[PDB]
Ligand SMILES: OC[C@H]1O[C@@H](O)[C@H](O)[C@@H](O)[C@@H]1O
């Protein structure tokens with residue numbers, strides 16, 4: 001059921017998991033929770049998500065709590081500013097250290113508690 005887009009395959013899960021259990025599932029399939037590095041990838045993802053919420057590879061790293069990608073794509077704060085839901089990341093309850101795709105818009109991301117369960121998206125490189 002993997003979907004192909006610009007050199008990568010994507011798995012939109014059918015069962016929900018916590019952020020880390022999701023990432024572990026992705027790793028077990030030679031993949032990672034998805035990074036998002038272009039307007040067209042964001043668009044592909046939120047359109048495919050069909051209005052449902054999916055964990056992506058957003059998580060905090062370092063003492064500063066900077067956002068990062070679990071697949072080790074460097075996180076570009078300037079280029080990604082356009083991708084959050086207005087008001088996010090808001091860090092609710094001081095306990096939202098992972099990120100999901102939530103709204104069907106370029107402005108899609110929300111920070112949510114890592115232990116909450118959601119459907120999730122894996123991203124797997126295609127290597128010819
Ligand atoms: O959905 C429950 C809550 O999750 C939080 O991450 C959001 O920032 C809030 O806007 C929302 O009410």
Ligand SMILES: [Ca+2]
Nearest residue numbers: 090091092111
């Ligand atoms: Ca939030």
